Design an enzyme around this catalytic site. Structure first.
Site, short mmCIF file in Angstrom:
data_model
loop_
_atom_site.label_atom_id
_atom_site.label_comp_id
_atom_site.label_asym_id
_atom_site.label_seq_id
_atom_site.Cartn_x
_atom_site.Cartn_y
_atom_site.Cartn_z
N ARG A 46 0.86 -1.17 0.00
CA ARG A 46 0.00 0.00 0.00
C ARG A 46 0.90 1.23 0.00
O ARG A 46 1.72 1.41 0.91
CB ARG A 46 -0.92 -0.01 1.22
CG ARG A 46 -1.90 1.18 1.33
CD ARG A 46 -2.73 1.07 2.61
NE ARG A 46 -3.83 0.09 2.49
CZ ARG A 46 -4.43 -0.50 3.51
NH1 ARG A 46 -4.06 -0.25 4.76
NH2 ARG A 46 -5.41 -1.37 3.29
N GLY A 47 0.77 2.04 -1.04
CA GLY A 47 1.44 3.33 -1.08
C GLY A 47 0.59 4.38 -0.38
O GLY A 47 -0.40 4.05 0.30
N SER A 50 -2.13 4.72 -3.33
CA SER A 50 -2.54 3.52 -4.05
C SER A 50 -2.35 2.22 -3.30
O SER A 50 -1.78 2.17 -2.21
CB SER A 50 -1.78 3.44 -5.38
OG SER A 50 -0.43 3.06 -5.14
N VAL A 52 -1.25 -1.90 -4.35
CA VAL A 52 -0.53 -2.62 -5.39
C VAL A 52 -0.66 -4.13 -5.19
O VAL A 52 -0.51 -4.63 -4.09
CB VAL A 52 0.98 -2.25 -5.37
CG1 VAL A 52 1.76 -3.03 -6.44
CG2 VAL A 52 1.17 -0.75 -5.55
N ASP A 155 11.41 11.03 -7.51
CA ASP A 155 11.31 10.04 -6.40
C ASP A 155 12.27 8.84 -6.62
O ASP A 155 11.89 7.68 -6.47
CB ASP A 155 9.85 9.56 -6.25
CG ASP A 155 9.52 9.03 -4.84
OD1 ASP A 155 10.26 9.29 -3.85
OD2 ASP A 155 8.47 8.33 -4.75
C1 LIG Z 1 4.19 1.67 -4.40
C2 LIG Z 1 4.30 1.34 -5.87
C3 LIG Z 1 3.94 2.28 -6.83
N1 LIG Z 1 4.03 1.99 -8.13
C4 LIG Z 1 4.47 0.81 -8.60
CL1 LIG Z 1 4.52 0.65 -10.36
C5 LIG Z 1 4.85 -0.17 -7.66
C6 LIG Z 1 4.76 0.11 -6.30
N2 LIG Z 1 5.20 -1.00 -5.64
C7 LIG Z 1 5.57 -2.01 -6.47
C8 LIG Z 1 6.06 -3.29 -6.23
C9 LIG Z 1 6.36 -4.12 -7.31
C10 LIG Z 1 6.17 -3.65 -8.61
C11 LIG Z 1 6.47 -4.51 -9.66
C12 LIG Z 1 6.30 -4.09 -10.98
O1 LIG Z 1 6.61 -4.95 -11.99
C13 LIG Z 1 5.81 -2.81 -11.25
C14 LIG Z 1 5.50 -1.95 -10.19
C15 LIG Z 1 5.67 -2.37 -8.87
C16 LIG Z 1 5.37 -1.55 -7.77
#
Ligand SMILES: Cc1cnc(Cl)c2c1[nH]c1ccc3cc(O)ccc3c12
EC number: 2.7.11.1
Length: 330
Positions: A46-47, A50, A52, A155
């Site tokens: 969790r961002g 968002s 994920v 970032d």
């Molecule tokens: C907090 C957050 C925001 N955006 C992405 Cl693309 C990710 C993210 N966490 C992850 C963790 C694994 C990921 C793996 C991916 O192939 C593409 C994006 C993420 C992302």
């Protein structure tokens, strides 16, 4: 008027020559795919904005990553989508594979290519000297590409660099803070994570550019070669600047703010003190000395400058002797 204006030294007018629709993200019309193609498997994180998930595309049976947005500042939505669409196909930029409407949250869900990575607290203790140079070059490819496309990431941190070590593959992720660079534009200083914030952010200087990303990469490099995570370890945003000053010295700090006719927050009066610039050799010891070379230190020294205008650009960084030992593909 108070503060002196500033401009990127490279890719300055990149956006101003492009069609209006390239950078005018507010006007972008989103092309929706089919949500039923995708099935959530495992929650990965969790961002701030968002949630994920690891998922699987049912139409091709391939692993996928789905980021479900929580729209409270709705502008960032069209901004992120347009940025990933513009950058798609570029070297070491994560691929946006689809955009669907999530039936539960009722908000956009970005579908990315899958990258299988290891934790950086586990991985940044393993990297040989050769591997630090390799992956650094790979990051630079990503940064030069987005800078050349008139985009700053804002970032760069070890969390945002996904790494497949078995396959020696790398991807720069999370473009949620990314923005188009327009000469003379004033940006929000509330970006990047604390340990990776450049001096410009910390002194409240809003007319920054791509060189922000280079300070950040500077912080990452210092943490890798010296084995010190993070390298500048601030209690908060104010003390973060104090941490930088204990290494780079206060006289050069005052020179920076004086050049740009900026005023430090008076809160700094009783906490900044008087510090000389340290020589990089002071952070070397028997545990990290195999990761350090003359070239590594010169390279670092040229990234970690107060004056954002004096920092190496991405392309200049790729030209550095530090990268001579690294075999290129092909
Ligand atoms: C907090 C957050 C925001 N955006 C992405 Cl693309 C990710 C993210 N966490 C992850 C963790 C694994 C990921 C793996 C991916 O192939 C593409 C994006 C993420 C992302």
């Amino acid at each position: 008027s108070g503060p002196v204006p500033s401009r990127a030294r490279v890719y300055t007018d990149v956006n101003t020559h492009r069609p209006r629709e390239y950078w005018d993200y507010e006007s972008h019309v989103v092309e929706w795919g089919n949500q039923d193609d995708y099935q959530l498997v495992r929650k990965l994180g969790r961002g701030k904005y968002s949630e994920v998930f690891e998922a699987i595309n049912i139409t091709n049976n391939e692993k996928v990553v789905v980021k479900i947005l929580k729209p409270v500042k709705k502008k960032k939505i069209k901004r992120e989508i347009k940025i990933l669409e513009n950058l798609r196909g570029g070297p070491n930029i994560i691929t946006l594979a689809d955009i669907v409407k999530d039936p539960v949250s009722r908000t956009p869900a970005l579908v990315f290519e899958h990258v299988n990575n290891t934790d950086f607290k586990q991985l940044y203790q393993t990297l040989t000297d050769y591997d630090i140079r390799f992956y650094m070059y790979e990051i630079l490819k990503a940064l030069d590409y987005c800078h050349s496309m008139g985009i700053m990431h804002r970032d760069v941190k070890p969390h945002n660099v996904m790494i497949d070590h078995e396959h020696r593959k790398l991807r720069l992720i999370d473009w949620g803070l990314a923005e188009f660079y327009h000469p003379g534009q004033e940006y929000n200083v509330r970006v990047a994570s604390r340990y990776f914030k450049g001096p410009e952010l910390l002194v409240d200087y809003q007319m920054y550019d791509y060189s922000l990303d280079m300070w950040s990469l500077g912080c990452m490099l210092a943490s890798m070669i010296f084995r010190k995570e993070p390298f500048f370890h601030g209690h908060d945003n104010y003390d973060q600047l104090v941490r930088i000053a204990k290494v780079l010295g206060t006289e050069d700090l005052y020179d920076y703010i004086d050049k740009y006719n900026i005023e430090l927050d008076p809160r700094f009066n009783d906490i900044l003190g008087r510090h000389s610039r340290k020589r990089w050799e002071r952070f070397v010891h028997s545990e990290n000395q195999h990761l350090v070379s003359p070239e590594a230190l010169d390279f670092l020294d040229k990234l970690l400058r107060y004056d954002h205008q004096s920092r190496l650009t991405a392309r200049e960084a790729m030209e550095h002797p530090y990268f001579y030992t690294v075999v290129k593909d092909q």
